[PDB]
Amino acid sequence: VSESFVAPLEKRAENDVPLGNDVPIIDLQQDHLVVVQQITKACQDFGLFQVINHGLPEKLMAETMDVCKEFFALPAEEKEKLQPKGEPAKFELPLEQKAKLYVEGEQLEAFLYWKDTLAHGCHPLDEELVNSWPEKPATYREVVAKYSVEVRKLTMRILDYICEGLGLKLGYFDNELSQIQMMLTNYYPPCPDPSSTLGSGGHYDGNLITLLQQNLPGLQQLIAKWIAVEPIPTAFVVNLGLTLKVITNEKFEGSIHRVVTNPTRDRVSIATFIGPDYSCTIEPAKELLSQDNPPLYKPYSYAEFGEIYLSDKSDYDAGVKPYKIN
Numbered sequence: 001v002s003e004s005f006v007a008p009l010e011k012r013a014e015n016d017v018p019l020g021n022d023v024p025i026i027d028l029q030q031d032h033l034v035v036v037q038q039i040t041k042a043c044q045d046f047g048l049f050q051v052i053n054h055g056l057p058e059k060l061m062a063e064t065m066d067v068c069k070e071f072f073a074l075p076a077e078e079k080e081k082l083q084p085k086g087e088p089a090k091f092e093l094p095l096e097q098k099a100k101l102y103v104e105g106e107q108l109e110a111f112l113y114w115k116d117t118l119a120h121g122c123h124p125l126d127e128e129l130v131n132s133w134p135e136k137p138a139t140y141r142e143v144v145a146k147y148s149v150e151v152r153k154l155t156m157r158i159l160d161y162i163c164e165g166l167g168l169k170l171g172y173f174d175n176e177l178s179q180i181q182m183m184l185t186n187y188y189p190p191c192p193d194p195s196s197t198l199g200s201g202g203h204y205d206g207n208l209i210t211l212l213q214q215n216l217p218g219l220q221q222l223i224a225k226w227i228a229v230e231p232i233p234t235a236f237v238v239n240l241g242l243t244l245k246v247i248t249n250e251k252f253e254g255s256i257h258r259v260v261t262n263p264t265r266d267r268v269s270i271a272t273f274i275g276p277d278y279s280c281t282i283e284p285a286k287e288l289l290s291q292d293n294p295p296l297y298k299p300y301s302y303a304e305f306g307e308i309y310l311s312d313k314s315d316y317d318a319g320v321k322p323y324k325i326n
């Protein structure tokens, strides 16, 4: 690998990361109250859990993964149509909702992630948005339209379980706090030296909540002990974001996680990031505050948070450090 992709010594993955046997696998077809309670325990203690029997068609999951892998198999001449000015876009504001290929890294010891990313908005689905999506493969738009609607449906169910668990009214997040739905498809090609590379560096998701679909190993969670998140192809991995951490006044944990590279086989993952518009104000939910539970963050601009989050990776919570109070 070129030196571009060489991570700093302290950020490199150990070669023998154990399976996380205490990662909660939550069956959404249990009784309502049991689902609320198990989800609540997972959010308070871990911030990362898998959902099964989640009501999203397994057939559609397999079809979306097929069309995403078909996309990354396309020749250079097709992929160039998604590279503004002949190169991949950067994860910086303004973050546009039209489909683009992205490159990602850290600017500390500057290095690149061993990863290609397709990203686009998904909400609301209109003709203009879908017309900005990939033209090839032919089925991408119709498959990923159905997927994004279904994934949102599931995400809003999970948020309402979360509302019940916290004692917030149902629909608390069904507003400006869940307005942006970015779908990222990540392609990790084989890496000849996995010891010095990362598919994705350690991070909280900056948004509210993320659903991640995987069928191969590579996802790891920090619990300074890293563990491997068992890939269940028919499950979704639920990652609680830094925004939900702030809004719950740290009653919920955020998921700190990373992706390691593989020397022999490639990997494709699908991540749906739901969260606020860049115009939102984020603060601890007033309904939960008291003299016993005083706010640990002052109100802040999501845009202003966005800029720090995407640029400064000196600390996992660099984005929210300026707004910490008490």
Ligand SMILES: CN1[C@H]2C[C@H](OC(=O)[C@H](CO)c3ccccc3)C[C@@H]1[C@@H](O)C2
Pocket (backbone or CB within 6 Å): 091, 095, 104, 182, 200, 203, 204, 205, 206, 207, 273, 274, 275, 306, 309, 310
């Ligand atoms: C490792 N990178 C982090 C930053 C960026 O994330 C995004 O692109 C999301 C998309 O919602 C975002 C969240 C919060 C603020 C801005 C962007 C791309 C990827 C993600 O896995 C998380």
Ligand SMILES: [Sr+2]
Pocket (backbone or CB within 6 Å): 080, 083, 086, 087, 088
């Ligand atoms: Sr190019």
Ligand SMILES: [Sr+2]
Pocket (backbone or CB within 6 Å): 131, 132, 133
């Ligand atoms: Sr177009």
Ligand SMILES: [V+3]
Pocket (backbone or CB within 6 Å): 203, 204, 205, 210, 239, 257
């Ligand atoms: V993530």
